Design a protein around this ligand. Structure first.
Ligand code: F6C
Ligand code: CLA
Ligand code: CLA
Ligand code: CLA
Ligand SMILES: CCCCCCCCCCCCCCCCCC(=O)OC[C@H](CO[C@@H]1O[C@H](CO)[C@H](O)[C@H](O)[C@H]1O)OC(=O)CCCCCCCCCCCCCCCCC
Ligand SMILES: CCCCCCCCCCCCCCCC(=O)OC[C@H](COP(=O)(O)OC[C@@H](O)CO)OC(=O)CCCCCCCCCCCCCCC
Ligand SMILES: CCCCCCCCCCCCCCCC(=O)OC[C@H](COP(=O)(O)OC[C@@H](O)CO)OC(=O)CCCCCCCCCCCCCCC
Ligand SMILES: CC1=C(/C=C/C(C)=C/C=C/C(C)=C/C=C/C=C(C)/C=C/C=C(C)/C=C/C2=C(C)CCCC2(C)C)C(C)(C)CCC1
Ligand SMILES: CC1=C(/C=C/C(C)=C/C=C/C(C)=C/C=C/C=C(C)/C=C/C=C(C)/C=C/C2=C(C)CCCC2(C)C)C(C)(C)CCC1
Ligand SMILES: CC1=C(/C=C/C(C)=C/C=C/C(C)=C/C=C/C=C(C)/C=C/C=C(C)/C=C/C2=C(C)CCCC2(C)C)C(C)(C)CCC1
Ligand SMILES: CC1=C(/C=C/C(C)=C/C=C/C(C)=C/C=C/C=C(C)/C=C/C=C(C)/C=C/C2=C(C)CCCC2(C)C)C(C)(C)CCC1
Ligand SMILES: CC1=C(/C=C/C(C)=C/C=C/C(C)=C/C=C/C=C(C)/C=C/C=C(C)/C=C/C2=C(C)CCCC2(C)C)C(C)(C)CCC1
Ligand code: SF4
Ligand code: SF4
Ligand SMILES: [Ca+2]
Ligand SMILES: [Ca+2]
Lengths: 139, 46, 172, 42, 80, 31, 61, 42, 31
C-alpha cells in the first residue's frame, strides 16, 4: 500500500472515473514542510498537509504537471513520486524511473530508439515497399 | 425550435398545412407573454 | 490561517470520497431522492431482472401511446389515432428491445469493457451479467406491449369509460 | 341533463380524474408503502 | 503507441526531456556531442504525441522526431 | 361568477408549497 | 434422461440439457406466440386503416 | 383519384410493401447485424 | 404498354442470381 494523507478537498467533478477502477489509476506522493494551498490538476484548490501527502489522479500527465510545474517550480518540493496502480492492486513506481530526474543525465541508462544518422538520411518509402519497416526504423 | 421549423417546411411541402405548427394548425400560443401584455395594458386602465 | 471549513459545508464529498467526481447534494444524496431512486424498479433490492423489466415496460409502453393519439397525423378520427399511437409505441419498444439485445450481445464478451468489467464499481449500473440483461429485455418487451395495449384499450373505449366515470351506465 | 355527473364549475374534468385517483387508484400503492415501512427489519 | 526517435545530431541540451508532459524522455550518457549526453525515449508507451519535445529542440533539422502510430487509451489522453 | 380555470390551476400550484413544507416538517419530526 | 438428453450425450443440436431451461423456454414460447398472433390479428383487423396509412390517405384531413 | 398513392404499373402493391421494408423495417436489423459484426472480440 | 406482373416477378427471380453471386464475391474478397 501507499502511505500518505490526502489533501483537504471538498470534492469536485474532475476526479476519477470508471477508467480508474477498470483499467488503471495513478498516485502522486510527496512531502511538504508545511500546510499550504495548491491547485488540483483538474481544477479547484486543495490544501496539502504538513506531513506526507498522497493524491489519486486519472492520468500520468496530471501527476507530471503537478510535480513539475507546482511542487518543484513553486513549492520547492523534490521528493514527489508517481505510481501506477492497477485494479488488482499491483503498484509500480514509474516516476522518477531510477530515482534520478530524467532531465539529469544518470549513469547506467541505455540508449533507446536511437538512430545512428541524421534525419535527412532516412530511406525513401519506395525502398521499403511491402517490407513492413518504416523509414525511421530502417537500419 | 429548428427541427420544428424543418417539420413545418416538410409539412408545407407535402401540402399538409393542418399538420404545421401555426395559428391554423397545431397552435403554440405564447400565453405568458400575452398575459403580460394584458396585465401591462390593464395596469394603466386601458 | 487556512480554513477550508469542510465540517460546516452544506455540500459534502460524495460517500466520503472527495476524488470520485461527485458531490453529496439534495439530488444525489438526500434521503427522499435516495429512497425514490433506489426503490425504482431498476434499482429496487431483491427484484429479479425480469420483474424490473416488466414494471419498466408497463410504465413506458403505457405512456408512449399518447403523443401520436393527440397530435399525430391520424388525430382527425378517434380509432385511427388510437391505432397510430399503439403502433408507434410498439415500434419504439421493439426498437429499444433490439438495442438492448445487441447491447447484451456486444458488451458481454470475455471481460466486458468499461463499467461492466469485473473490477468496475459502478453502483448506478448493477446488472453485471448477460443473463440478467436478457431477462430484463424479455420483461421490458412484455411489459411495454402490455402497457401499450392497456392504453390502447382505454382510449378505444373512451366513450364507454367516460360514461363509466360519470355514472351514465346507471341509467338502465 | 341530469343523467350523468357534470360540473358547471371551472375545470369540471378535475373530479372526473381526482376522485378515481384518491379513492381507488392511489390508495393501494399508499397502503403498500405503509406496509413496507411498518414491516422493515431493524 | 507513438514512436519517438533520437538522431545523432542531438547536442544534449536536455530541453526535450524538460518539455515532455508525460516523462517519456531521459538523458543518457553519450560521446557524440560536447554535452556528453543524448536524449532517449524508454517510455514511448506514455507518449501522447503533443510534440512539445520537437518544439523545444534547437537543432536544425530536429534531433528528436515523433511519428504518430496506433492510438491507445493513454496516447489519446483519455481520463475515462 | 365563480373562479376560472386559471385560478384553479394557480391554486393547485400554490398548494404545492405547503405540500413540500409539510413533508419537510414531517420528516424533521420523525428524526 | 434417455437418449440425446442424457448427461453423457454430446448432441450439439440439442443444447437445452436442463429441465428448468425447458420450462423457461415454454413460458417464452407461449407468451411470444400469443403476442405474435395478436399482433397479426390487430394488423388484419385494421387492414383498411393500415392500407390508408401506407398510401398516405390519412393526410387528406 | 389523387387522394392516395396508387400505381397504374403492374403489381402496384410492390412499392406498398417494399418501401416500408427497405426504409423503416429491415434497416434497424441491418444496423444491428453491422453493430454485432464491428463489435466482435478477437 | 408497360410490362406485366409476370415480367416483374421473373425479373425479381432473375435478380436473385446476381445477388447470390455478389454475396459470394464479397465473402471471397473479405478473405
Ligand atoms: C407529447 C406529449 C404527450 C401527449 C400528447 O399530447 C400525451 C397524451 C395523452 C392522452 C392520449 C391520454 C389522456 C387521454 C384523456 O384525456 O382521456 C383518457 C384518460 C383516461 C381514460 C384515464 C382514466 C383513468 C386512468 C385509467 C387512471 C390512470 C391509471 C394510472 C396510470 C395507474 C397508476 C399506477 C401507479 C400508482 C403509478 C394520456 C394519458 C397519460 N399520460 Mg400522456 N401524453 C404525453 C406525454 C406524457 C408524459 C411525458 C407522461 C409521463 C411519463 C405521460 C403520462 C400519462 C399517464 C400516466 C396517462 C394516463 O393515464 C392517460 C391515458 O393514457 O389514459 C388512458 N404522458 N396522455
Ligand atoms: C427549457 C428550455 C426553454 C427555454 C430557454 C425557453 C425560453 C423561453 N420561453 Mg419557453 N417553454 C419551454 C422551454 C423553454 N423556453 C417548454 C418546455 C414549454 C412548454 C411548457 C415552454 C412554453 C412557453 C410558453 C407558453 C411561453 C414561453 C416563452 C418563452 C420566452 C420567455 C421566457 C419565459 O418566461 O417563458 C416561460 C416559460 C416557461 C414557463 C416554460 C417552463 C420552462 C421550465 C423551466 C422547464 C421545464 C421543462 C424541462 C425542459 C423538462 C425537465 C426535464 C427533467 C429531467 C427535469 C423564452 C424565450 C414565452 C414567449 O414566447 O414569450 C414571447 C411564452 O409565452 N415558453
Ligand atoms: C383541508 C382542505 C380541503 C378539504 C377537506 C377538501 C375536500 C375535498 N376536495 Mg379539495 N382542495 C383544497 C382543500 C380541501 N379540499 C385546496 C386548498 C385546493 C386547491 C389546491 C383543492 C382542490 C380540489 C380539486 C381540484 C378537487 C377537490 C376535490 C375535493 C373533494 C374530494 C377529495 C379530493 O379529490 O381531493 C382533491 C384535493 C386536492 C387536489 C388538493 C388538496 C389540497 C389540500 C390543501 C390538502 C389538505 C391535506 C390535509 C390538510 C392533511 C390531512 C391530515 C390528516 C391527518 C387528516 C373533497 C370534498 C375534488 C372535487 O371537487 O370533487 C367533487 C376535486 O376535483 N379539491
Ligand atoms: C441499381 C439499380 C436499381 C436502383 C437504383 C433502383 C431504385 C429503386 N427501385 Mg428498383 N429494381 C431494380 C434495380 C434498381 N432499382 C431491378 C433490377 C429490379 C428487378 C428485380 C427492381 C425492382 C423493383 C421493385 C419491384 C420496386 C423497386 C423500387 C425502387 C425504388 C425504391 C427502392 C426499393 O424499394 O428498391 C427495391 C429493389 C428491389 C426489389 C430489388 C433491387 C435489385 C437491384 C439490382 C439491387 C442493386 C444493388 C446495388 C447495385 C448495390 C449497391 C452497392 C452500394 C455500395 C451502393 C427506387 C427508385 C420500388 C418502387 O418502385 O418504388 C416506387 C419497388 O416496389 N425496384
Ligand atoms: C391521468 C392523466 C390524464 C387525465 C386525463 C383526464 C381527461 C378528462 C376528460 C373527461 C371529459 C370527457 C368529456 C367528453 C368529451 C370529450 C373530450 O373532452 O375529450 C377529451 C380530450 C381527448 O379527446 C378524445 O380523444 C379520444 C381519443 O381516442 C377520442 O378521439 C374522443 O372522441 C376525443 O374526445 O382530451 C384531450 O384532448 C387531452 C389532451 C392531452 C392531455 C395530455 C395529458 C398528459 C398527462 C401527463 C401527466 C401524467 C403523469 C404525471
Ligand atoms: C396524493 C397523496 C398521497 C399520500 C402522500 C404521499 C405518501 C408518501 C410520502 C413519503 C414517501 C417517502 C418517505 C420519506 C423518505 C424516507 O426514506 O425518509 C426516511 C426518514 C428517516 O428515516 P430514518 O430516521 O430511519 O433514517 C433512515 C435514512 O435512510 C434517512 O435518514 O423516515 C421516514 O420514513 C420519514 C417519516 C415518515 C413519513 C412522514 C409522513 C409522510 C409525508 C406526509 C406529508 C405529505 C405531503 C404531500 C404533499 C404532496
Ligand atoms: C435487403 C438487403 C439487406 C442487406 C443485405 C444483407 C445483409 C447481411 C448479409 C450478410 C450476413 C451474413 C454475413 C456472412 C456470413 C459470415 O459469417 O461470414 C463470415 C465471413 C468470414 O469471416 P472470417 O474471415 O472472420 O472467418 C470466420 C469464419 O467463421 C468463417 O470463415 O466474414 C464475413 O462476415 C463476410 C464479409 C462481410 C459481409 C460482406 C458483405 C455482405 C453481402 C453483400 C452483398 C449482399 C447481396 C444481397 C443479395 C440478396
Ligand atoms: C432503452 C432502455 C434501456 C437501455 C437500452 C440500451 C442500453 C440500448 C442500446 C442500444 C444500442 C447499443 C444500439 C445500437 C445501435 C447501432 C447502430 C445504429 C449502428 C449503425 C451502424 C451503421 C450505420 C454502420 C455503418 C457502416 C460501418 C461502420 C461499416 C461498414 C459500412 C457501413 C456504412 C455499413 C435500459 C436498459 C436502460 C432500460 C430499458 C429501456
Ligand atoms: C416523479 C414524480 C412525478 C411523476 C410521475 C410519473 C412520471 C408517473 C408516470 C406514471 C405512468 C406513466 C404510469 C403507467 C402505468 C401503467 C400501468 C399500470 C399499466 C398496466 C398494464 C396492464 C395491466 C397491461 C395488461 C395487459 C397485458 C400485460 C397483456 C394482455 C393485454 C393487457 C392490456 C390486459 C410527479 C411529477 C407526478 C410528481 C413528483 C414526483
Ligand atoms: C395546475 C398546473 C400544474 C399542476 C399542478 C399540480 C399537479 C399540483 C398538485 C398539488 C397537490 C396534489 C398538492 C398537495 C398538497 C398537500 C398538502 C398541503 C398537505 C399538507 C399536509 C399537512 C400540513 C399535514 C402534515 C402532517 C404533519 C405535519 C405530521 C404528521 C403527518 C401529517 C401528514 C398529518 C403544473 C405545474 C403541472 C403546470 C401548471 C398548471
Ligand atoms: C430464411 C430466409 C428467408 C425466409 C424468411 C422467413 C421465413 C421469415 C419469416 C418472418 C416472420 C414470420 C416474422 C414474424 C415476425 C413477428 C413479429 C415482429 C411479431 C411481433 C409481435 C409483437 C410486437 C407483439 C406484441 C404483443 C404482445 C407481446 C402482447 C400484447 C399484444 C401485442 C400485440 C402488443 C427468405 C425466403 C425470405 C430469403 C432466404 C432466407
Ligand atoms: C417473384 C417470385 C418470387 C420471389 C422472388 C424474390 C423474393 C426475389 C428477391 C430478389 C431480391 C431482393 C434480389 C436482390 C438482389 C441483390 C443484388 C443484385 C445486389 C448486388 C450487389 C452488388 C453487386 C454489390 C456487391 C458488393 C461487393 C462486390 C463488395 C462490397 C460490398 C458490395 C455489397 C457493395 C418467388 C421465388 C417466391 C416465387 C416466384 C415469383
Ligand atoms: S510527443 Fe509529447 S509526450 Fe511524446 S515524447 Fe514528445 S513531448 Fe513527450
Ligand atoms: S533531441 Fe533536441 S532538445 Fe532533446 S537533447 Fe537533443 S538537441 Fe536537445
Ligand atoms: Ca346499468
Ligand atoms: Ca391527417
Amino acid at each position: 500500500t501507499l502511505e500518505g494523507q490526502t489533501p483537504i478537498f471538498g470534492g469536485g467533478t474532475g476526479g476519477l472515473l470508471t477508467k480508474a477502477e477498470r483499467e488503471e489509476k495513478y498516485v502522486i506522493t510527496w512531502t511538504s514542510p508545511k500546510e499550504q494551498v495548491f491547485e488540483m490538476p483538474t481544477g479547484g484548490s486543495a490544501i496539502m498537509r504538513q506531513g506526507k501527502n498522497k493524491l489519486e489522479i486519472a492520468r500520468k500527465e496530471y501527476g507530471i504537471a503537478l510535480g513539475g510545474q507546482q511542487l518543484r517550480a513553486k513549492f520547492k518540493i523534490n521528493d514527489y513520486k508517481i505510481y501506477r496502480v492497477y485494479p488488482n492492486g499491483e503498484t509500480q513506481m514509474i516516476h522518477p524511473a531510477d530515482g534520478v530526474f530524467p532531465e539529469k543525465v544518470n549513469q547506467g541508462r541505455p540508449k533507446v530508439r536511437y538512430v545512428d544518422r541524421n534525419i535527412g538520411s532516412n530511406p525513401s518509402p519506395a525502398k521499403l515497399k511491402f517490407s513492413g519497416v518504416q523509414p525511421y526504423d530502417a537500419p | 425550435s429548428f427541427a420544428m421549423y424543418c417539420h413545418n417546411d416538410t409539412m408545407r411541402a407535402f401540402g399538409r398545412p393542418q399538420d404545421m405548427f401555426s395559428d391554423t394548425g397545431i397552435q403554440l400560443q405564447p400565453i405568458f407573454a400575452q398575459w403580460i401584455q394584458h396585465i401591462h395594458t390593464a395596469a394603466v386602465g386601458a | 490561517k487556512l480554513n477550508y471549513r469542510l465540517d460546516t459545508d452544506p455540500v459534502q464529498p460524495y460517500k466520503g470520497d472527495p476524488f470520485n467526481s461527485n458531490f453529496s447534494t439534495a439530488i444525489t444524496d438526500s434521503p427522499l431522492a435516495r429512497a425514490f431512486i433506489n426503490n425504482l424498479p431498476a434499482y429496487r433490492k431483491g427484484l429479479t431482472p425480469f420483474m424490473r423489466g416488466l414494471e419498466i415496460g408497463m410504465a413506458h409502453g403505457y405512456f408512449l401511446v399518447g403523443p401520436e393519439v393527440v397530435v399525430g397525423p391520424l388525430r382527425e378520427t378517434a380509432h385511427g389515432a388510437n391505432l397510430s399511437g399503439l403502433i408507434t409505441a410498439i415500434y419504439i419498444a421493439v426498437s429499444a428491445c433490439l438495442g438492448i439485445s445487441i447491447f447484451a450481445i456486444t458488451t458481454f464478451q470475455g471481460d466486458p469493457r468499461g463499467a461492466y468489467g469485473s473490477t468496475s464499481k459502478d453502483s448506478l449500473r448493477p446488472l453485471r451479467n448477460r443473463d440478467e440483461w436478457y431477462q430484463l429485455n424479455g420483461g421490458i418487451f412484455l411489459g411495454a406491449m402490455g402497457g401499450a395495449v392497456f392504453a390502447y384499450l382505454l382510449l378505444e373505449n373512451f366513450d364507454a369509460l367516460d360514461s363509466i366515470l360519470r355514472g351514465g351506465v346507471n341509467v338502465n | 341533463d341530469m343523467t350523468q355527473l357534470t360540473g358547471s364549475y371551472a375545470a369540471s374534468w378535475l373530479p372526473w380524474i381526482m376522485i378515481p385517483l384518491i379513492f381507488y387508484i392511489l390508495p393501494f400503492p399508499v397502503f403498500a408503502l405503509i406496509f413496507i415501512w411498518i414491516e422493515k427489519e431493524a | 503507441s507513438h514512436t519517438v526517435k533520437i538522431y545523432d545530431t542531438c547536442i544534449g541540451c536536455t530541453q526535450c526531456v524538460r518539455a515532455c508532459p508525460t516523462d517519456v524522455l531521459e538523458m543518457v550518457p553519450w560521446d557524440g556531442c560536447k554535452a556528453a549526453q543524448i536524449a532517449s525515449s524508454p517510455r514511448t508507451e506514455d507518449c501522447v504525441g503533443c510534440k512539445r519535445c520537437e518544439t523545444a529542440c534547437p537543432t536544425d533539422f530536429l534531433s528528436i522526431r515523433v511519428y504518430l502510430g496506433a492510438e491507445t487509451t493513454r496516447s489519446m489522453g483519455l481520463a475515462y | 361568477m365563480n373562479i376560472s380555470d386559471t385560478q384553479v390551476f394557480v391554486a393547485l400550484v400554490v398548494a404545492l408549497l405547503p405540500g413540500l413544507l409539510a413533508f419537510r416538517l414531517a420528516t424533521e419530526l420523525y428524526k
